[PDB]
């Protein structure tokens, strides 16, 4: 039957929809209570929650000797989440960047460019182990600086985490529900390709961030969706990438990892010499197209 594929689809909309503005919510309401910035919830909690797809799907391929899709899923994601995720909210809410958020960046910048030198030969479990160790310094780091927490069965407080959890149960469901519909949909059209099939769930495993951020853009919170941006990016490196190198040697991936530390230093450069607005989203876009047109499926 094919229905059940449509069925699952939309439902897979609904949740996505609804789930993406109660986590937004929930994680805005958390910050303030543990006073913490946007950005620093956007890139802990709301990267991991949202990478959560990436890291099993790069550990998973790996396991089964297929580490050109672990690596191709977790720097294809990164792409994604700056030219598409990125693109599309500085254009519905310009962000101008504080000066020790562009700190941030600037550390972001630097753990990008060192995967892409340390991978050049591809990336190793010992590569693994120092990316996922700098991923960890990464979110301490972030954490203090942002932190201003001087000082129990509070509502507000659980009233915050039941939004911010069931709101990712819903992001993450409603995500498996569109691929695995889109799938089905698919097989009994029999138009099913593999080729094409990888970057189904490719992107699939980047529907949480596009609908959490866009989310996030719609309230203004312009902070939280650069802070899911990156944190996620690094997610991906220091966790999803990491994970899969355990299991076995990623191939090199330079051309895509020289377009992610191009679009890297874009992001840097605007957020400290400029703003991250309409036109810089739109260029952001462009160069995701350009992307999804020439490199290799
Ligand atoms: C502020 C500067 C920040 C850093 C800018 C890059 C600096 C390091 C470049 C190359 C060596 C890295 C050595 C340590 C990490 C790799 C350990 C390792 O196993 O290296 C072999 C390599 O992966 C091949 O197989
Ligand atoms: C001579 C090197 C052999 C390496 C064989 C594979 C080792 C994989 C280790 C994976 C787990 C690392 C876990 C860190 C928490
Ligand atoms: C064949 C296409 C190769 C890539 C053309 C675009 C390169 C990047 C251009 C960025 C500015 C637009
Ligand atoms: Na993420
Ligand atoms: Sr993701
Ligand atoms: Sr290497």
């Not at 929930?26 to 946007?38: D, K, L, P």
Request: charged share 10%.
């Amino acid at each position: 039957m094919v229905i059940l594929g449509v069925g699952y689809f939309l439902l897979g909309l609904i949740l996505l929809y609804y789930g993406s503005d109660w986590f937004v919510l929930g994680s805005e309401r958390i910050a303030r209570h543990f006073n913490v910035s946007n950005f620093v919830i956007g890139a802990t909690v709301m990267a991991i929650g949202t990478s959560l797809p990436e890291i099993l799907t790069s550990a998973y391929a790996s396991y089964m000797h297929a580490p050109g899709i672990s690596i191709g899923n977790a720097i294809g994601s990164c792409i994604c989440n700056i030219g598409l995720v990125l693109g599309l909210s500085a254009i519905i809410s310009p962000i101008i960047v504080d000066k020790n958020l562009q700190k941030n960046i600037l550390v972001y910048l630097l753990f990008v460019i060192f995967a892409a030198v340390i991978g050049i030969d591809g990336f190793s479990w010992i590569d693994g182990v120092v990316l996922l160790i700098l991923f960890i310094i990464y979110l301490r780091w972030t954490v203090k600086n942002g932190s201003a927490e001087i000082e129990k069965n509070n509502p507000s407080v659980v009233f915050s985490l039941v939004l911010l959890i069931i709101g990712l149960i819903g992001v993450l469901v409603g995500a498996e529900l569109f691929v695995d519909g889109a799938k089905k949909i698919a097989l009994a059209l029999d138009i099913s390709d593999k080729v094409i099939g990888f970057t189904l769930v490719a992107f699939g495993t980047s529907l949480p961030e596009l609908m959490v951020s866009l989310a996030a853009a719609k309230r203004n919170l312009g902070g939280m969706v650069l802070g899911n941006v990156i944190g996620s990016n690094i997610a991906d490196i220091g966790g999803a990438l990491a994970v899969g190198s355990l299991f076995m040697h990623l191939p090199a991936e330079n051309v895509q990892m020289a377009v992610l530390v191009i679009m890297s230093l874009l992001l840097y450069l605007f957020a400290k010499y400029s703003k991250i607005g309409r036109w810089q989203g739109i260029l952001f876009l462009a160069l995701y197209i350009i992307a999804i047109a020439s490199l290799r499926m």
